[PDB]
């Protein structure tokens, strides 16, 4: 059984490929050919927020589409007011090597993590008029890459030990552990119904997980390098990815195969972040060539360019009402576009 | 603006004052990155070090300057996914064990990757060769032929030690980069002076380039 079981794995792999091939009859481009193009999209900078003295690595929008949080390597967390460009809080960090941050849907907590292998949770609305550390989550053997809030008492984290986890904040314990990846997990994205999530790793694959049962249901492999960003479609039946090979792709849950690729002969740099619009017609991506690009999600046609940064763009974000988009880069500045 | 709106702006400006003050205090620091294989005297490089697993930080002061040291040893993951964080460091310290033949051909591989990385094109390196006395006593039984098949010469203390240094220095391929080499034992105490003298030379070379001479 040392080598006999190897043949079984190969046979099952070819069985799945034949099933997907027989399920493909027409392409997305052919179906969408007789559709009016969106045209040209032009956006102008509206706000510029200053105060960070180092590179910016992550940001997150609040559910009210007015507040946001930003993390920098200077060991500071800042909560801004988008309308008035005002500073609400300034949170010092014990470790200055941070890589991710998140905002709770209720608006009472924020989270951060990095090279210390610990996820920290801060309490915003409490007596004494100050922000204090409420819980430190330990148990990962690698750096944290991303974290997202399910509720006020649950959080999902991805780490560099090829493992995802789900925690109970009050108990401080790891309720469920997700295993199966080969390379380091870099991204994370939650479904609108808060029942499934997808992740991208350095082995050029993406997986779909079950939160309640802790099992893997589908694996998508069509890339050629590390997958850095991932995002769900507003419908919840599709998702998009971005990799270091200067290419974006769209995958379908029900058809279980790739649908469309986004590429050009000029771009050679990698992709740091991806995001959708409120309707899903536009796809926004950030590159290392100092620019942000806008794609037509249905016709794969480039529609606009956002050029206002003099360093690498690292993070993106779209409000819940879909009124503005925010970009952060390594020049210690972040802007709001409309 | 309303009465409550005027008070909000006042609070925001007090935060700016504290943020500006914190930047000035943190700018008078020297940042160093510590690299090397396991069991190479990384934790005993300077006797007066104070600790301030993931990442370990250590700081000490000499003359009137503050030094901060970072030891990325507990990160057993893909190095290329977090190495760009330490892009603004002044220099890199690499430790090599002269009495460990097995770690050879492994320290050389790590040296080649760091010295030829995109984010470290113009960063100087300080090289420390440890266990000077242990290597001399051990070379009597093993004439350095186990590690390097191609080596000739009467190897008592000097030529063998000079051969290893030339092997490491051959990996440099940048005109704006320099390597500083020193040999230390477990009883040496003047290790802070060597780092101080090296960083003084690095800053001078940077300022010549702005003038246009270098």
């Amino acid at each position, epitope marked *: 059984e040392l080598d006999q079981l190897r043949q079984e794995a190969e046979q099952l792999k070819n069985q799945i490929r034949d099933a997907r091939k027989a399920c493909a009859d027409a392409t997305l481009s052919q179906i969408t050919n007789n559709i009016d193009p969106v045209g040209r999209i032009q956006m102008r900078t509206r706000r510029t927020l200053r105060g960070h003295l180092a590179k910016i690595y992550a940001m997150h929008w609040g559910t009210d589409s*007015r*507040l946001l949080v930003s993390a920098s390597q200077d060991g500071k967390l800042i909560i801004w*007011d988008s309308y008035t460009t*005002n500073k*609400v809080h300034a949170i010092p960090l014990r470790s200055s090597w941070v890589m991710t941050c998140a905002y709770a849907p209720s608006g009472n907590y924020v989270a951060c993590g990095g090279l210390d292998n610990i996820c920290s949770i801060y309490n915003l609305k409490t*007596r*004494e*008029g*100050n922000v204090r550390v409420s819980r430190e989550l330990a148990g990962h053997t690698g750096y944290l890459s991303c974290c997202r809030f399910l509720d006020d008492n649950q959080i999902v984290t991805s780490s560099g030990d090829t493992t995802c986890a789900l925690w109970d904040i009050e108990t401080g314990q790891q309720t469920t552990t997700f295993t199966g990846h080969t390379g380091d997990v870099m991204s994370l994205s939650l479904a609108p119904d808060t029942r499934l999530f997808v992740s991208g790793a350095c082995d050029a694959s993406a997986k779909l997980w079950d939160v309640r049962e802790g099992m893997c249901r589908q694996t998508f492999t069509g890339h050629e390098s590390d997958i850095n960003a991932i995002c769900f479609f507003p419908n919840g039946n599709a998702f998009a990815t971005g990799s270091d090979d200067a290419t974006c792709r769209l995958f379908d849950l029900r058809a279980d195969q790739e649908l469309m690729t986004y590429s050009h002969d000029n771009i050679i740099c990698g992709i740091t972040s991806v995001s959708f619009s409120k309707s899903g017609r536009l796809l926004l991506a950030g590159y290392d060539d100092f620019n942000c690009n806008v794609w037509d999600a249905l016709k794969a046609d480039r529609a606009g360019v956002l050029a206002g940064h003099d360093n690498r763009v690292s993070c993106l974000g779209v409000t819940d009402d879909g009124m503005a988009v925010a970009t952060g880069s390594w020049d210690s500045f972040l802007k709001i576009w409309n | 603006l*309303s*009465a*409550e*709106d005027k*008070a*909000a702006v*006042e*609070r925001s400006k*007090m935060i700016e004052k504290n943020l500006k003050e914190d930047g000035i205090s943190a700018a008078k620091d020297v940042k160093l990155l510590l690299l090397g294989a396991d069991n190479s005297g990384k934790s005993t490089i300077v006797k007066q070090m104070k600790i301030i697993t993931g990442i370990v930080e250590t700081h000490f002061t000499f003359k009137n300057l503050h030094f901060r040291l970072f030891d990325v040893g507990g990160q057993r993951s893909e190095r290329k996914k977090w190495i760009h964080c330490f892009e603004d460091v002044t220099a890199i310290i690499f430790c090599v064990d002269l009495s460990d033949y097995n770690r050879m051909h492994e320290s050389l591989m790590l040296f080649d990757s760091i010295c030829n990385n995109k984010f470290f094109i113009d960063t100087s390196i300080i090289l420390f060769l440890n266990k000077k006395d242990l290597f001399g006593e051990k070379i009597k039984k093993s004439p350095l032929t186990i590690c390097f098949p191609e080596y000739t010469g009467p190897n008592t203390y000097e030529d063998a030690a000079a051969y290893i240094q030339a092997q490491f220095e051959s990996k440099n391929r940048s005109p704006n980069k320099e390597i500083y080499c020193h040999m230390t034992c477990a009883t040496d105490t003047n290790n802070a002076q060597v780092i101080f003298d090296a960083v003084t030379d690095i800053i001078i070379a940077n300022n010549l380039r702005g003038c246009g001479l270098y």
Partner: single-chain antibody
Amino acid sequence: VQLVESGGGLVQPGGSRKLSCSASGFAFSSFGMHWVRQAPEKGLEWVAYISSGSGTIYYADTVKGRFTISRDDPKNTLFLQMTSLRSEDTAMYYCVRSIYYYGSSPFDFWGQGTTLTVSSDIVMTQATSSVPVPGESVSISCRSSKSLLHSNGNTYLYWFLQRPGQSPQLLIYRMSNLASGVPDRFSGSGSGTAFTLTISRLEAEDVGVYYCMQHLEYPLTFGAGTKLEL
């Protein structure tokens, strides 16, 4: 959170006195401070205000020129120096904390005060004075001279309750929001120049005097007050 006030006594007219307030249990340097006094048989009245960092000071027209307010952040103490005392300064003086940012709830904590004995404005009207009234719905109304609705979409109206032998506490801030640690049976709604406070399923520990306050512009003004009795 504690606020203990010290001072008081009997002072001949024309003398000078100072009051002190010690804070313990919260970050004192990040909070603004107010002085509010209450006459023996009247309502509340605002006196002075000092901002976080001692960068802004406001006074009332009655005590301007003879009252001084100061704070000592390292010692966590607040002072109020008063000179040329008259017979109209006999009242009980309270100390209030407040913080201002997006989503804040100022005037949240009050402290027991000390009794001192000496021996263009906006008008807020509460026509009702005494309402006889458990298990019933009660509505109280307040009126304003000018509209309290700013162009930014906020209405600056506050509600307070004072039980006998106690200190006032916050119930509603900005005319719609419910303060922390208050039962959901309290509700408040209204429009420009007209406001209403409604209580559903009235029970014990809900009898006292209710005050309506404006925070649109300095100086701050209160109402006459409405008393609920069984």
